[PDB]
Amino acid sequence: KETAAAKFERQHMDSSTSAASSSNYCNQMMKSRNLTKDRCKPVNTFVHESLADVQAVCSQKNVACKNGQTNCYQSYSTMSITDCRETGSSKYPNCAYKTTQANKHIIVACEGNPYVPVHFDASV
Ligand SMILES: O=c1ccn([C@@H]2O[C@@H](CN3CCOCC3)[C@H](O)[C@H]2O)c(=O)[nH]1
């Protein structure tokens, strides 16, 4: 199958690129990470920091999750991220995305033992 931790890594981690995401990046990555199989996932963020650094966020600033749960954590430092946002003219199965790089604090939901990221909540 796929654990929640692994699913977070597949959907949200891209440590291999520092911050040079081309205009093609989201189009390629949304497909390669299997986020366009059942539908075009409308919004998805990739984090270009080490797995250790992102995992460390679960020990950082506790904040409320958007859904009202209390297991969200905000990074003390800004992180290099790429936001992928489905274009207005994107039509499944040909999902099309705008690629936007940012340096922002991330907010993730953490669960389990070990306590690790399982959802990407927001960037601020
Ligand atoms: O800045 C972001 C914000 C969201 N996501 C994605 O959308 C989040 C939740 N959505 C909330 C609205 O209903 C559809 C699902 C997912 O948890 C997360 O995968 C981002 O990736 N980066």
UniProtKB/Swiss-Prot annotation:
Glycosylated residues in this chain: 1, 7, 34, 37, 41
Catalytic activity field: an [RNA] containing cytidine + H2O = an [RNA]-3'-cytidine-3'-phosphate + a 5'-hydroxy-ribonucleotide-3'-[RNA]; an [RNA] containing uridine + H2O = an [RNA]-3'-uridine-3'-phosphate + a 5'-hydroxy-ribonucleotide-3'-[RNA]
GO BP, one annotated term: defense response to Gram-positive bacterium
Location(s) in or outside the cell: Secreted
GO molecular function, one term: lyase activity
Entry EC no(s): 4.6.1.18
GO cellular component: extracellular region
Effect of residue 119 to A: Loss of activity
Keyword Ligase: no
Tissue specificity note: Pancreas.
UniProt entry keywords in alphabetical sequence: Disulfide bond, Endonuclease, Glycation, Glycoprotein, Hydrolase, Lyase, Nuclease, Secreted, Signal
Binding site for substrate: 7, 10, 41-45, 66, 85
Cysteine-cysteine disulfides: 26-84, 40-95, 58-110, 65-72
Active site: 12, 119
Entry function: Endonuclease that catalyzes the cleavage of RNA on the 3' side of pyrimidine nucleotides. Acts on single-stranded and double-stranded RNA.
Protein family per UniProt: Belongs to the pancreatic ribonuclease family.
Subunit comment: Interacts with and forms tight 1:1 complexes with RNH1. Dimerization of two such complexes may occur. Interaction with RNH1 inhibits this protein. Monomer.
Protein's UniProt name: Ribonuclease pancreatic
Protein species of origin: Bos taurus
Full-protein interval shown: 27 to 150 of 150
